């Protein structure tokens, strides 16, 4: 995913960073990109959202829970996002785990309000909005043609290779034994996303916490596998 991360890096890191080939070029795509992946779970999407945290302002709003937890006030918080995104623009607007549509007719008018209001109706574009969701087919087609004009990226299905690589990244911070092999894991699993391997990591470190040990023998790795293997 090196090209997939350097294309979002070069895509959204062109404004306000390395500006000698952005404002002199006369392009200015002030719309950001749209992220989605079959694994989802915000692991790769947060590993790509963290690639922009180096020199920028980060703003993470996960899901529409803060909207659907009270009376239907509506797009007023989105207008607040337009006044804070207008009076203060370094911040890339990063929205992860978009499960608003999944009332519904008010999500269509705050979707038309963020679509219409996001284009920069009063200025020459003002804020980059990177969107991240789990499924791209459930979203209404109103955000596609008017909103997305620059680029949207798709995540391929590895089946084996980035299951091994995602295992390597999930187990990079953790400690894996020598006898813990990878072929039986990437092979024994059948269409399991990053959340399930994050769950077997969760039973690895959590079941290691059950015995208050930092090391996980193979026998304790299958006995630890039984924890979420029974819980899931």
């Amino acid at each position: 995913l090196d090209n997939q991360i350097q294309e979002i890096k070069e895509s959204v890191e062109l404004p306000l960073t390395h500006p000698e080939y952005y404002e002199e070029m006369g392009i200015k795509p002030p719309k950001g990109v749209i992220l989605y992946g079959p694994p989802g779970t915000g692991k790769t999407l947060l590993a790509k959202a963290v690639a922009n945290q180096t020199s920028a302002t980060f703003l993470r709003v996960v899901g529409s829970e803060l909207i659907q937890k009270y009376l239907g006030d509506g797009p007023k918080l989105v207008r607040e996002l337009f006044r804070v995104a207008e009076e203060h623009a370094p911040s890339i607007v990063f929205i992860d785990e978009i499960d608003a549509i999944g009332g519904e007719r008010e999500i269509q008018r705050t979707m038309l309000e963020l679509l219409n209001q996001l284009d920069g109706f009063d200025s020459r574009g003002d804020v980059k909005v990177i969107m991240a969701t789990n499924r791209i087919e459930t979203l209404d087609p109103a955000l596609i043609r008017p909103g997305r004009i620059d680029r949207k990226i798709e995540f391929p299905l590895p089946d084996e290779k980035t299951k091994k690589r995602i295992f390597q990244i999930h187990t990079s911070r953790m400690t894996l034994a020598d006898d813990v092999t990878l072929d039986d894991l990437i092979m024994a699993k059948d269409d399991l996303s990053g959340a399930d391997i994050k769950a077997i990591c969760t039973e690895a470190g959590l079941m290691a916490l059950r015995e208050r040990r930092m090391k996980v023998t193979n026998e304790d790795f299958k006995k630890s596998k039984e924890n979420v293997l029974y819980k899931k």
Partner: protein, 410 residues
């Protein structure tokens, strides 16, 4: 190298020089001319621009050519020579002011201004004393300029800026002295200060130069000497608290910080302004404790005191976060006071709060000060004096003739 390595466009001369009108934003266009900088188109933009201007605006615009020519010593004489000894008093007095602004080591412009000086009532050479005593103070323990200043303070003109640029000029001559001095210069201006109890602005800008002569101390007992011989009813208590401000430039002396907390609640609402305004001078290095609850107060100026306490620092997100609340105010002196530090603290984020001010208003002071802030955007005493003298902007436009000649701007 500035003309070589930098390339500024013309749409700010034309645009920023196009939103000016009503003879006050025209003064903001003298601010455009003097504090715009490569390109010098607005400098040579035809004529009659100074003829439409006012009198103190003729001082500010005559000094604007002094601000555009901080270089080209040989060109300064052949550019200001047209405005020298002209028909209009403010053209020649602001022209000598320009001669004092353009350089600080020429010292050959003195004689034509110094010879004319004596007026003894009102005459032009007292305004040439404004621009030439102030501009020579910018050019400068001399022992001929103060002997020439003896009939200056002895004259005692009704114009405030006479003693203004006298005290400030001799103070800039005296800043950095060896543990200060209590000599007959500032003793003489203390006795002649208390001589006439009129126009308390004298009692405001004379302690400016007093405390400037107090600067440079390491162990001076001048706070106790002034505690003896400058203490009176509240017409010299501002001088006492000014010597208290300038005598405590800053060290580890938290006893004066709890003294600051105790005397902060004084009924007099000016020693609060300057004595509480000393915070940006005292703790200027350990700026992590400088954010305080001064904005949460409910007095008359305290929010202005913290607003000045921002200053011209690099201005991290917390400072602009304080400018979020300080930016929105209803009084014209605080809404007028916010763009100064708002644009000094930031020298795609500069012009956005300016458009926020356009959303605030759309008076004249706020518009002139917000364009003046556009031009602002685009322990050295030389950067500490000009604004501590500028803390008295809430007056007539005559002071705004001395507002344009601040040397703190690099």
């Amino acid at each position: 190298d500035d003309i070589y390595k930098t390339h500024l466009e013309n749409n700010r001369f034309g645009g920023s020089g196009s939103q000016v009108d009503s003879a006050r934003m025209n003064l903001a266009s003298s601010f455009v001319n003097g504090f715009v900088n490569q390109d010098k188109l607005l400098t040579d933009d035809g004529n009659k621009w100074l003829y439409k201007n006012k009198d103190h605006g003729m001082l500010s615009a005559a000094a604007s050519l002094g601000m555009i020519l901080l270089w080209d010593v040989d060109g300064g004489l052949t550019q200001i020579d047209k405005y020298l000894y002209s028909s209009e008093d403010y053209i020649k007095s602001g022209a000598l002011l320009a001669c004092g602004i353009v350089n600080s080591g020429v010292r050959n412009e003195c004689d034509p201004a110094l010879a004319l000086l004596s007026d003894y009532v009102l005459h032009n050479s007292n305004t040439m004393r404004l621009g030439s005593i102030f501009g020579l103070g910018l050019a400068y323990n001399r022992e001929d300029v103060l002997t020439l200043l003896l009939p200056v303070m002895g004259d005692s003109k009704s114009s405030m800026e006479v003693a203004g640029v006298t005290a400030l000029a001799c103070g800039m001559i005296a800043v950095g002295s060896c543990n200060g001095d209590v000599t007959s210069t500032i003793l003489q201006t203390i006795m002649e200060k208390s001589e006439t109890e009129l126009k308390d602005t004298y009692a405001r800008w004379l302690p400016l130069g007093l405390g400037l002569n107090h600067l440079g101390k390491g162990e001076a007992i001048e706070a106790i000497l002034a505690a003896l011989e400058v203490v009176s009813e509240p017409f010299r208590s501002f001088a006492n608290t000014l010597v208290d401000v300038c005598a405590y430039a800053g060290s580890g002396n938290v006893l004066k910080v709890q003294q600051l907390l105790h005397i902060c609640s004084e009924h007099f609402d000016s020693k609060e302004k300057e004595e509480d305004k000393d915070k940006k001078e005292k703790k200027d290095k350990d700026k992590k404790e400088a954010p305080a609850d001064m904005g949460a107060h409910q007095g008359v100026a305290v929010l202005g005191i913290a607003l000045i306490a921002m200053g011209e620092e690099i201005g991290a997100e917390m400072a602009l976060r304080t400018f979020g609340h300080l930016l929105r105010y209803g009084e014209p002196t605080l809404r007028r006071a916010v763009p100064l530090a708002l644009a000094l603290i930031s020298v795609s984020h500069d012009a956005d709060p300016e458009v926020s001010y356009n959303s605030i208003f759309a008076a004249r002071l706020a518009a002139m000060l917000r364009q003046l802030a556009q031009y602002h955007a685009k322990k050295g005493t030389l950067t500490l004096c000009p604004y501590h003298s500028d803390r008295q902007l809430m007056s007539q436009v005559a002071v705004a003739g001395l507002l344009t000649v601040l040397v703190s701007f690099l």
